[PDB]
Amino acid sequence: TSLAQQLQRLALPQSDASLLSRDEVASLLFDPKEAATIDRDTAFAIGCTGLEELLGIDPSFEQFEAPLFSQLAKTLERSVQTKAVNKQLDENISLFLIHLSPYFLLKPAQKCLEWLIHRFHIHLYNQDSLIACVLPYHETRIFVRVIQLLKINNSKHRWFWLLPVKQSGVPLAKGTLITHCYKDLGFMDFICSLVTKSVKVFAEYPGSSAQLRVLLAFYASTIVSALVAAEDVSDNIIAKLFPYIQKGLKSSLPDYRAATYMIICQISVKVTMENTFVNSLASQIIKTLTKIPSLIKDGLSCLIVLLQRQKPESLGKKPFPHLCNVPDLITILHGISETYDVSPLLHYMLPHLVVSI
Amino acid sequence: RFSALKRRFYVTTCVGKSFHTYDVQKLSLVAVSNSVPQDICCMAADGRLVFAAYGNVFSAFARNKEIVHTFKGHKAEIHFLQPFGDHIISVDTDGILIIWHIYSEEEYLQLTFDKSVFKISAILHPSTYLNKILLGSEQGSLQLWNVKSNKLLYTFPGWKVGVTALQQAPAVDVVAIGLMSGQVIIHNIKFNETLMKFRQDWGPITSISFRTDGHPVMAAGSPCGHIGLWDLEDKKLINQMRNAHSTAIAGLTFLHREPLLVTNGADNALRIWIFDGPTGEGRLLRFRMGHSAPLTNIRYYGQNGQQILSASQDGTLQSFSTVHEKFNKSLGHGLINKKRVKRKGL
Amino acid sequence: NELVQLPLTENIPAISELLHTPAHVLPSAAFLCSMFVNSLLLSK
Amino acid sequence: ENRAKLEARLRTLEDRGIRKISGTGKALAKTEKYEHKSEVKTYDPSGD
Amino acid sequence: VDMMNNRFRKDMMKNASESKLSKDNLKKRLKEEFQHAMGGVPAWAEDDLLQRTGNFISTSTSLPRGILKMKNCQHANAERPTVAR
């Protein structure tokens, strides 16, 4: 089996057996027996029909007509071309899957995904991109089909923990997702990197905030729950989370800032923090408050939480001027005061206010 | 050290009055050198030979076992050895720098530096530079010299802390400078700009290595025994390896085009680290280790006499073979409730 | 002197019900942030 | 009121059955053997 | 400089004409060998808690819940042992 282990480690998607025979064909829409009786023209027609339907709902797909849904893509087969061509194809497929992710529950997206699987074998070459595209819909059955397309049998594979949902045909449970998220840091880094990349891609198009809704909600749903599930939050988790927290604070998307606020609130509730890190977090919250005028109040309330569950003298005097210069500060503070306690913020403010006067 | 006629890398560690050579593939001993009268203070390797310094005299070793050339003419202890083609550069304690031809053993050039003004604490020969060496000082200044012309090309004002380490970055004109304060400075010596700065609060920079397997990662050691991993691309801290060695880190090097790190220390341990886990978590791959604490009791075991049982202050019992080190074995630590140790580790 | 127990995420029923729903059914993140941060505050 | 409580209980039962088949998820990917790359090129500064 | 008759430089020759290369030809030859060995040119070559090393988790003044840190001590009545309740 030493020769067998060497051979199975030497295996590559380029030298797959299914490339050289038509006994079995992988298909998202059809069983393999019927899928082995489909000509390339029929699959191309289904993909073009799906893309044409998708163009009506969202225009910005037109750029994918030429590289992926044309005659040149029809004739092209990846194994024949060099690594640079495959890398460019990987970039194009990743961009198209990022665009597809909001519409995955719709049928035209399924047709386009079927054409991509038939022509480019993305289940072998682009496993990570496909998983990133389909992950926020893990409670659905089409997710189970997409997982069943992949081969994850090896216990040393990255996606081995997704094996039972392939074997039993059941959706992934959220508790397992949370446990693997907090215990395995690579999965959390994958989720954060996917969120940042999708936000950066969708930033260019004006009026595209809605397209990022569900994914961002998923980003809000798991991480906080992961912080709930962990018995003790080690310094590794916070060290990994902090750059993404800063990126969320620096962004202009309301939902991304809201998810960052929830993550910050949960972290402040659960773990005790050194004075320096509380100071830096409060400085970053105060300095970037006024960028989004619709998220002022929550941000201020978030600061209150950070100033209520930590040591009283954690915060310094440096962010005090920028805190005072926000428009209508006392009116928002009074509006919050009508329902909730605002004592920590005034407790911080008054000794600095008298000295500054 | 890389080898000719054998596409393999060898690591050489100083052991008292001798040195040992191991293949990096499996950490198997391949040679043991002859003894020298004094303890070895500095070592260097140039592929063909191994250079060792003891007292005020240094010699060259061939076949990793025997001396073929010895060099006399220094009145103080040597701390630095720089192989330069067919020539060798030696730096004394008082401040004498002499270039010697290895085979003929004659002195090519003699240079002196004022101890108060410029005491050499680090030496580096940048790659693709014709007859050029870089000199660092405890005062904090850097001098670029040309051996052939025997003139000072340029003087870098540097920083007031003082230089402890010099390392060639994977670039034509970029070097890494370590400071006593714990600060690593990435500098371009041709046009005099600093690309980026990193700081660790663990003491002076012991050694710096660069990962060249396609990932821009830099590692710097500390006297506390900790190693910091920095991302050159994003200018941030990736992760920190705490207590890699109990004692101070002596030397750390990434294998060329490999995700492997080779570290040794004063705790009588040579270890290999592989960065293949998720999120770049280094893990122990291979190690060759002996007692890390002074011995308490040693007794011969067996009438055949090929093994000796030894006990140390680290709480371990070990057996050392007298014929070959492949038969060395360890009996472990003294532990009640061994089944709990399985669950949580040592 | 007086000891006050601050609200916790697992104890709040509304937050748990909001966290137990599937992601695609889940509403926008701004509403979730509003409810979460308001529930984390101490009510007077 | 009683109908809403039963439906809330029924949703929990479906999720728990899914959780049983899917697994805890505490397990991670297992480690793999490593072999060194051979015939690797290197630069010798002695030529300088 | 003599590319041939030098052990280190003879491995760097390409054709028979370059027995002796000039200074400028040697520089680009040395540079490209370095870049081939390094695998190319790295991209990086042409307030915040992760620009320094430090901690993130600290101890609280209040007693933590869930787990109590305790150590057993010597028995109070060790000097006077008894069997009664």
PDB file of C-alpha atoms in Angstrom, chain A residues 29-270:
ATOM      1  CA  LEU A  29     -29.515  18.595 -12.756  1.00  0.00           C
ATOM      2  CA  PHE A  30     -29.631  14.978 -13.974  1.00  0.00           C
ATOM      3  CA  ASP A  31     -28.793  11.482 -12.829  1.00  0.00           C
ATOM      4  CA  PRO A  32     -25.546  10.213 -14.421  1.00  0.00           C
ATOM      5  CA  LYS A  33     -27.241   7.666 -16.707  1.00  0.00           C
ATOM      6  CA  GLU A  34     -29.296  10.382 -18.408  1.00  0.00           C
ATOM      7  CA  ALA A  35     -26.391  12.833 -18.070  1.00  0.00           C
ATOM      8  CA  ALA A  36     -24.197  10.542 -20.196  1.00  0.00           C
ATOM      9  CA  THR A  37     -26.634  10.945 -23.123  1.00  0.00           C
ATOM     10  CA  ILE A  38     -26.363  14.759 -23.346  1.00  0.00           C
ATOM     11  CA  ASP A  39     -24.432  16.372 -26.194  1.00  0.00           C
ATOM     12  CA  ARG A  40     -22.277  19.467 -25.673  1.00  0.00           C
ATOM     13  CA  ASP A  41     -24.726  21.499 -27.775  1.00  0.00           C
ATOM     14  CA  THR A  42     -27.620  20.767 -25.403  1.00  0.00           C
ATOM     15  CA  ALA A  43     -25.635  21.728 -22.292  1.00  0.00           C
ATOM     16  CA  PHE A  44     -24.410  24.877 -24.047  1.00  0.00           C
ATOM     17  CA  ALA A  45     -28.018  25.762 -24.901  1.00  0.00           C
ATOM     18  CA  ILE A  46     -29.108  25.239 -21.280  1.00  0.00           C
ATOM     19  CA  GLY A  47     -26.258  27.423 -20.026  1.00  0.00           C
ATOM     20  CA  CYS A  48     -27.011  30.175 -22.537  1.00  0.00           C
ATOM     21  CA  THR A  49     -30.714  30.075 -21.633  1.00  0.00           C
ATOM     22  CA  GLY A  50     -29.871  30.349 -17.937  1.00  0.00           C
ATOM     23  CA  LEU A  51     -27.534  33.285 -18.528  1.00  0.00           C
ATOM     24  CA  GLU A  52     -30.126  35.012 -20.730  1.00  0.00           C
ATOM     25  CA  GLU A  53     -32.707  34.628 -17.961  1.00  0.00           C
ATOM     26  CA  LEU A  54     -30.192  35.950 -15.417  1.00  0.00           C
ATOM     27  CA  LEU A  55     -29.492  39.020 -17.574  1.00  0.00           C
ATOM     28  CA  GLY A  56     -33.087  40.188 -17.131  1.00  0.00           C
ATOM     29  CA  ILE A  57     -32.949  40.222 -13.331  1.00  0.00           C
ATOM     30  CA  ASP A  58     -29.438  41.687 -13.102  1.00  0.00           C
ATOM     31  CA  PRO A  59     -27.640  43.433 -15.990  1.00  0.00           C
ATOM     32  CA  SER A  60     -24.064  43.298 -14.676  1.00  0.00           C
ATOM     33  CA  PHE A  61     -23.726  39.677 -15.846  1.00  0.00           C
ATOM     34  CA  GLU A  62     -23.115  40.758 -19.470  1.00  0.00           C
ATOM     35  CA  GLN A  63     -19.326  40.681 -18.989  1.00  0.00           C
ATOM     36  CA  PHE A  64     -19.523  36.895 -18.557  1.00  0.00           C
ATOM     37  CA  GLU A  65     -21.021  36.413 -22.039  1.00  0.00           C
ATOM     38  CA  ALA A  66     -17.658  36.442 -23.816  1.00  0.00           C
ATOM     39  CA  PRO A  67     -15.156  34.447 -21.689  1.00  0.00           C
ATOM     40  CA  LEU A  68     -17.483  31.739 -20.344  1.00  0.00           C
ATOM     41  CA  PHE A  69     -20.655  31.558 -22.461  1.00  0.00           C
ATOM     42  CA  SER A  70     -19.376  31.867 -26.038  1.00  0.00           C
ATOM     43  CA  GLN A  71     -18.054  29.632 -28.807  1.00  0.00           C
ATOM     44  CA  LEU A  72     -14.471  30.135 -27.611  1.00  0.00           C
ATOM     45  CA  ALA A  73     -15.419  28.784 -24.183  1.00  0.00           C
ATOM     46  CA  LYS A  74     -17.381  26.004 -25.903  1.00  0.00           C
ATOM     47  CA  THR A  75     -14.328  24.700 -27.774  1.00  0.00           C
ATOM     48  CA  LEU A  76     -11.868  25.337 -24.930  1.00  0.00           C
ATOM     49  CA  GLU A  77     -10.768  22.445 -22.712  1.00  0.00           C
ATOM     50  CA  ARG A  78      -8.569  23.254 -19.723  1.00  0.00           C
ATOM     51  CA  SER A  79      -6.188  20.277 -19.890  1.00  0.00           C
ATOM     52  CA  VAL A  80      -4.816  21.338 -23.284  1.00  0.00           C
ATOM     53  CA  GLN A  81      -3.732  24.836 -22.217  1.00  0.00           C
ATOM     54  CA  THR A  82      -0.928  25.943 -19.904  1.00  0.00           C
ATOM     55  CA  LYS A  83      -1.022  26.928 -16.235  1.00  0.00           C
ATOM     56  CA  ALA A  84      -1.398  30.650 -16.988  1.00  0.00           C
ATOM     57  CA  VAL A  85      -4.564  30.013 -19.013  1.00  0.00           C
ATOM     58  CA  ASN A  86      -5.907  27.867 -16.169  1.00  0.00           C
ATOM     59  CA  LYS A  87      -5.110  30.650 -13.682  1.00  0.00           C
ATOM     60  CA  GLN A  88      -6.977  33.218 -15.789  1.00  0.00           C
ATOM     61  CA  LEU A  89      -9.881  30.769 -16.079  1.00  0.00           C
ATOM     62  CA  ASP A  90      -9.799  30.352 -12.295  1.00  0.00           C
ATOM     63  CA  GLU A  91     -10.054  34.121 -11.828  1.00  0.00           C
ATOM     64  CA  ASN A  92     -12.964  34.343 -14.281  1.00  0.00           C
ATOM     65  CA  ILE A  93     -14.806  31.411 -12.679  1.00  0.00           C
ATOM     66  CA  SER A  94     -14.270  32.811  -9.175  1.00  0.00           C
ATOM     67  CA  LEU A  95     -15.654  36.197 -10.243  1.00  0.00           C
ATOM     68  CA  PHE A  96     -18.652  34.576 -11.943  1.00  0.00           C
ATOM     69  CA  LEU A  97     -19.373  32.420  -8.879  1.00  0.00           C
ATOM     70  CA  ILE A  98     -19.144  35.492  -6.632  1.00  0.00           C
ATOM     71  CA  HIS A  99     -21.749  37.107  -8.885  1.00  0.00           C
ATOM     72  CA  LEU A 100     -23.842  33.906  -8.877  1.00  0.00           C
ATOM     73  CA  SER A 101     -23.911  33.476  -5.085  1.00  0.00           C
ATOM     74  CA  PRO A 102     -26.895  35.827  -4.401  1.00  0.00           C
ATOM     75  CA  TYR A 103     -29.053  34.107  -7.050  1.00  0.00           C
ATOM     76  CA  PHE A 104     -28.093  30.486  -6.323  1.00  0.00           C
ATOM     77  CA  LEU A 105     -31.596  29.491  -5.194  1.00  0.00           C
ATOM     78  CA  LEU A 106     -33.003  30.464  -8.605  1.00  0.00           C
ATOM     79  CA  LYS A 107     -33.189  27.999 -11.515  1.00  0.00           C
ATOM     80  CA  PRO A 108     -31.152  30.026 -14.092  1.00  0.00           C
ATOM     81  CA  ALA A 109     -28.188  30.027 -11.706  1.00  0.00           C
ATOM     82  CA  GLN A 110     -28.535  26.244 -11.462  1.00  0.00           C
ATOM     83  CA  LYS A 111     -28.510  25.989 -15.266  1.00  0.00           C
ATOM     84  CA  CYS A 112     -25.384  28.158 -15.488  1.00  0.00           C
ATOM     85  CA  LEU A 113     -23.713  26.066 -12.778  1.00  0.00           C
ATOM     86  CA  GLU A 114     -24.648  22.902 -14.687  1.00  0.00           C
ATOM     87  CA  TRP A 115     -23.035  24.271 -17.852  1.00  0.00           C
ATOM     88  CA  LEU A 116     -19.912  25.241 -15.892  1.00  0.00           C
ATOM     89  CA  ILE A 117     -19.659  21.765 -14.346  1.00  0.00           C
ATOM     90  CA  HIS A 118     -20.181  20.104 -17.734  1.00  0.00           C
ATOM     91  CA  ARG A 119     -17.599  22.209 -19.588  1.00  0.00           C
ATOM     92  CA  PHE A 120     -14.904  23.203 -17.067  1.00  0.00           C
ATOM     93  CA  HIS A 121     -15.255  20.473 -14.383  1.00  0.00           C
ATOM     94  CA  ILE A 122     -15.247  23.028 -11.570  1.00  0.00           C
ATOM     95  CA  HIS A 123     -16.066  20.268  -9.068  1.00  0.00           C
ATOM     96  CA  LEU A 124     -12.484  19.054  -9.598  1.00  0.00           C
ATOM     97  CA  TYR A 125     -10.571  22.287 -10.292  1.00  0.00           C
ATOM     98  CA  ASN A 126     -12.482  24.909  -8.255  1.00  0.00           C
ATOM     99  CA  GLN A 127     -13.732  23.135  -5.134  1.00  0.00           C
ATOM    100  CA  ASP A 128     -13.052  26.093  -2.826  1.00  0.00           C
ATOM    101  CA  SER A 129     -14.869  28.597  -5.050  1.00  0.00           C
ATOM    102  CA  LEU A 130     -17.908  26.321  -5.375  1.00  0.00           C
ATOM    103  CA  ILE A 131     -18.049  25.709  -1.611  1.00  0.00           C
ATOM    104  CA  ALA A 132     -17.743  29.451  -0.976  1.00  0.00           C
ATOM    105  CA  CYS A 133     -20.580  30.078  -3.437  1.00  0.00           C
ATOM    106  CA  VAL A 134     -22.927  27.456  -1.964  1.00  0.00           C
ATOM    107  CA  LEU A 135     -22.073  27.696   1.764  1.00  0.00           C
ATOM    108  CA  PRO A 136     -24.696  30.280   2.950  1.00  0.00           C
ATOM    109  CA  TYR A 137     -27.450  27.905   1.716  1.00  0.00           C
ATOM    110  CA  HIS A 138     -26.305  24.833   3.656  1.00  0.00           C
ATOM    111  CA  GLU A 139     -29.837  24.198   4.965  1.00  0.00           C
ATOM    112  CA  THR A 140     -31.156  23.481   1.455  1.00  0.00           C
ATOM    113  CA  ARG A 141     -31.235  20.277  -0.594  1.00  0.00           C
ATOM    114  CA  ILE A 142     -29.546  21.718  -3.690  1.00  0.00           C
ATOM    115  CA  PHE A 143     -26.600  22.271  -1.339  1.00  0.00           C
ATOM    116  CA  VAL A 144     -26.696  18.524  -0.671  1.00  0.00           C
ATOM    117  CA  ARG A 145     -26.598  17.866  -4.419  1.00  0.00           C
ATOM    118  CA  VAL A 146     -23.611  20.197  -4.894  1.00  0.00           C
ATOM    119  CA  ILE A 147     -21.791  18.446  -2.037  1.00  0.00           C
ATOM    120  CA  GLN A 148     -22.644  15.067  -3.595  1.00  0.00           C
ATOM    121  CA  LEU A 149     -20.907  16.250  -6.769  1.00  0.00           C
ATOM    122  CA  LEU A 150     -17.591  16.575  -4.907  1.00  0.00           C
ATOM    123  CA  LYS A 151     -15.268  13.737  -3.861  1.00  0.00           C
ATOM    124  CA  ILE A 152     -14.123  14.199  -0.250  1.00  0.00           C
ATOM    125  CA  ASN A 153     -13.609  10.587   0.840  1.00  0.00           C
ATOM    126  CA  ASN A 154     -10.007  10.965   2.047  1.00  0.00           C
ATOM    127  CA  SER A 155      -9.767  11.701   5.772  1.00  0.00           C
ATOM    128  CA  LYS A 156      -6.828  14.066   5.172  1.00  0.00           C
ATOM    129  CA  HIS A 157      -8.831  16.211   2.736  1.00  0.00           C
ATOM    130  CA  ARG A 158      -9.712  19.784   3.677  1.00  0.00           C
ATOM    131  CA  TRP A 159     -13.460  19.183   3.225  1.00  0.00           C
ATOM    132  CA  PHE A 160     -13.588  15.732   4.850  1.00  0.00           C
ATOM    133  CA  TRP A 161     -15.933  16.893   7.630  1.00  0.00           C
ATOM    134  CA  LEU A 162     -18.610  17.398   4.948  1.00  0.00           C
ATOM    135  CA  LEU A 163     -18.583  13.648   4.224  1.00  0.00           C
ATOM    136  CA  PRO A 164     -21.812  12.524   6.022  1.00  0.00           C
ATOM    137  CA  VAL A 165     -24.082  15.044   4.274  1.00  0.00           C
ATOM    138  CA  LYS A 166     -22.910  13.452   1.013  1.00  0.00           C
ATOM    139  CA  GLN A 167     -23.360   9.877   2.253  1.00  0.00           C
ATOM    140  CA  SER A 168     -26.772  10.346   3.888  1.00  0.00           C
ATOM    141  CA  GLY A 169     -28.277  13.079   1.700  1.00  0.00           C
ATOM    142  CA  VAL A 170     -29.202  15.471   4.515  1.00  0.00           C
ATOM    143  CA  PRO A 171     -28.510  19.221   4.842  1.00  0.00           C
ATOM    144  CA  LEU A 172     -25.649  20.388   7.018  1.00  0.00           C
ATOM    145  CA  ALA A 173     -26.641  21.242  10.578  1.00  0.00           C
ATOM    146  CA  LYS A 174     -25.753  24.685  11.882  1.00  0.00           C
ATOM    147  CA  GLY A 175     -24.366  23.296  15.148  1.00  0.00           C
ATOM    148  CA  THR A 176     -21.739  21.273  13.288  1.00  0.00           C
ATOM    149  CA  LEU A 177     -20.869  24.384  11.266  1.00  0.00           C
ATOM    150  CA  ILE A 178     -20.430  26.407  14.474  1.00  0.00           C
ATOM    151  CA  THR A 179     -18.307  23.717  16.137  1.00  0.00           C
ATOM    152  CA  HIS A 180     -16.020  23.333  13.124  1.00  0.00           C
ATOM    153  CA  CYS A 181     -15.856  27.127  12.836  1.00  0.00           C
ATOM    154  CA  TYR A 182     -14.602  27.778  16.349  1.00  0.00           C
ATOM    155  CA  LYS A 183     -12.471  24.638  16.756  1.00  0.00           C
ATOM    156  CA  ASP A 184     -10.870  24.875  13.288  1.00  0.00           C
ATOM    157  CA  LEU A 185      -9.466  28.351  12.638  1.00  0.00           C
ATOM    158  CA  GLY A 186      -8.860  27.713   8.935  1.00  0.00           C
ATOM    159  CA  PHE A 187     -12.599  27.562   8.278  1.00  0.00           C
ATOM    160  CA  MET A 188     -13.140  30.876  10.082  1.00  0.00           C
ATOM    161  CA  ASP A 189     -10.318  32.463   8.078  1.00  0.00           C
ATOM    162  CA  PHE A 190     -11.937  31.069   4.917  1.00  0.00           C
ATOM    163  CA  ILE A 191     -15.289  32.638   5.832  1.00  0.00           C
ATOM    164  CA  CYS A 192     -13.737  36.024   6.638  1.00  0.00           C
ATOM    165  CA  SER A 193     -11.643  36.034   3.449  1.00  0.00           C
ATOM    166  CA  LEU A 194     -14.699  35.122   1.364  1.00  0.00           C
ATOM    167  CA  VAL A 195     -16.726  37.933   2.949  1.00  0.00           C
ATOM    168  CA  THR A 196     -13.965  40.501   2.382  1.00  0.00           C
ATOM    169  CA  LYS A 197     -13.393  39.407  -1.225  1.00  0.00           C
ATOM    170  CA  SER A 198     -17.110  39.463  -2.062  1.00  0.00           C
ATOM    171  CA  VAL A 199     -17.499  42.917  -0.493  1.00  0.00           C
ATOM    172  CA  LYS A 200     -14.504  44.222  -2.455  1.00  0.00           C
ATOM    173  CA  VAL A 201     -15.887  42.780  -5.705  1.00  0.00           C
ATOM    174  CA  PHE A 202     -19.371  44.225  -5.190  1.00  0.00           C
ATOM    175  CA  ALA A 203     -18.102  47.631  -4.006  1.00  0.00           C
ATOM    176  CA  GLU A 204     -17.521  48.861  -7.567  1.00  0.00           C
ATOM    177  CA  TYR A 205     -21.149  48.580  -8.722  1.00  0.00           C
ATOM    178  CA  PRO A 206     -23.426  51.337  -7.360  1.00  0.00           C
ATOM    179  CA  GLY A 207     -26.654  50.275  -5.696  1.00  0.00           C
ATOM    180  CA  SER A 208     -25.461  46.698  -5.125  1.00  0.00           C
ATOM    181  CA  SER A 209     -25.818  46.613  -1.326  1.00  0.00           C
ATOM    182  CA  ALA A 210     -28.799  44.242  -1.459  1.00  0.00           C
ATOM    183  CA  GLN A 211     -26.824  41.578  -3.357  1.00  0.00           C
ATOM    184  CA  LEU A 212     -24.608  41.148  -0.278  1.00  0.00           C
ATOM    185  CA  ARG A 213     -27.514  40.819   2.177  1.00  0.00           C
ATOM    186  CA  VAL A 214     -27.838  37.083   2.859  1.00  0.00           C
ATOM    187  CA  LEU A 215     -24.098  36.352   2.829  1.00  0.00           C
ATOM    188  CA  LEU A 216     -23.439  39.162   5.303  1.00  0.00           C
ATOM    189  CA  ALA A 217     -26.282  37.879   7.475  1.00  0.00           C
ATOM    190  CA  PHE A 218     -24.604  34.471   7.357  1.00  0.00           C
ATOM    191  CA  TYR A 219     -21.352  36.187   8.333  1.00  0.00           C
ATOM    192  CA  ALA A 220     -23.221  37.747  11.249  1.00  0.00           C
ATOM    193  CA  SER A 221     -24.994  34.509  12.162  1.00  0.00           C
ATOM    194  CA  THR A 222     -22.119  32.054  12.532  1.00  0.00           C
ATOM    195  CA  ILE A 223     -19.200  33.976  14.055  1.00  0.00           C
ATOM    196  CA  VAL A 224     -21.186  35.363  16.997  1.00  0.00           C
ATOM    197  CA  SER A 225     -22.683  31.909  17.538  1.00  0.00           C
ATOM    198  CA  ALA A 226     -19.163  30.487  17.320  1.00  0.00           C
ATOM    199  CA  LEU A 227     -18.099  32.905  20.047  1.00  0.00           C
ATOM    200  CA  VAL A 228     -21.080  31.643  22.044  1.00  0.00           C
ATOM    201  CA  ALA A 229     -20.130  27.999  21.514  1.00  0.00           C
ATOM    202  CA  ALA A 230     -16.484  28.232  22.594  1.00  0.00           C
ATOM    203  CA  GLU A 231     -15.888  27.307  26.226  1.00  0.00           C
ATOM    204  CA  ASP A 232     -12.869  29.638  26.353  1.00  0.00           C
ATOM    205  CA  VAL A 233     -11.908  32.144  23.658  1.00  0.00           C
ATOM    206  CA  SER A 234      -8.136  31.918  23.290  1.00  0.00           C
ATOM    207  CA  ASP A 235      -5.911  34.743  22.086  1.00  0.00           C
ATOM    208  CA  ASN A 236      -5.567  32.991  18.707  1.00  0.00           C
ATOM    209  CA  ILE A 237      -9.240  33.564  17.857  1.00  0.00           C
ATOM    210  CA  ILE A 238      -9.155  37.272  18.718  1.00  0.00           C
ATOM    211  CA  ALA A 239      -5.797  37.713  16.967  1.00  0.00           C
ATOM    212  CA  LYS A 240      -7.298  36.213  13.809  1.00  0.00           C
ATOM    213  CA  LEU A 241     -10.531  38.206  14.125  1.00  0.00           C
ATOM    214  CA  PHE A 242      -8.976  41.633  14.740  1.00  0.00           C
ATOM    215  CA  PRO A 243      -7.797  42.489  11.164  1.00  0.00           C
ATOM    216  CA  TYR A 244     -11.240  41.600   9.816  1.00  0.00           C
ATOM    217  CA  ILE A 245     -12.794  43.712  12.582  1.00  0.00           C
ATOM    218  CA  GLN A 246     -10.677  46.674  11.465  1.00  0.00           C
ATOM    219  CA  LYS A 247     -11.586  46.046   7.816  1.00  0.00           C
ATOM    220  CA  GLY A 248     -15.265  46.017   8.771  1.00  0.00           C
ATOM    221  CA  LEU A 249     -14.855  49.267  10.692  1.00  0.00           C
ATOM    222  CA  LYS A 250     -13.107  50.938   7.740  1.00  0.00           C
ATOM    223  CA  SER A 251     -15.744  49.893   5.184  1.00  0.00           C
ATOM    224  CA  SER A 252     -18.727  51.938   4.012  1.00  0.00           C
ATOM    225  CA  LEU A 253     -21.307  49.141   3.707  1.00  0.00           C
ATOM    226  CA  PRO A 254     -23.955  49.386   6.466  1.00  0.00           C
ATOM    227  CA  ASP A 255     -24.506  45.630   6.833  1.00  0.00           C
ATOM    228  CA  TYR A 256     -20.777  44.871   7.043  1.00  0.00           C
ATOM    229  CA  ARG A 257     -20.334  47.509   9.759  1.00  0.00           C
ATOM    230  CA  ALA A 258     -23.377  46.091  11.565  1.00  0.00           C
ATOM    231  CA  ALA A 259     -21.888  42.582  11.521  1.00  0.00           C
ATOM    232  CA  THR A 260     -18.605  44.003  12.823  1.00  0.00           C
ATOM    233  CA  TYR A 261     -20.550  45.745  15.604  1.00  0.00           C
ATOM    234  CA  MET A 262     -22.252  42.491  16.625  1.00  0.00           C
ATOM    235  CA  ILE A 263     -18.916  40.650  16.638  1.00  0.00           C
ATOM    236  CA  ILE A 264     -17.325  43.397  18.761  1.00  0.00           C
ATOM    237  CA  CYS A 265     -20.269  43.357  21.180  1.00  0.00           C
ATOM    238  CA  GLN A 266     -20.119  39.581  21.634  1.00  0.00           C
ATOM    239  CA  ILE A 267     -16.335  39.625  22.139  1.00  0.00           C
ATOM    240  CA  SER A 268     -16.639  42.419  24.714  1.00  0.00           C
ATOM    241  CA  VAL A 269     -19.379  40.495  26.528  1.00  0.00           C
ATOM    242  CA  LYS A 270     -17.486  37.207  26.726  1.00  0.00           C
TER     243      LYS A 270
END
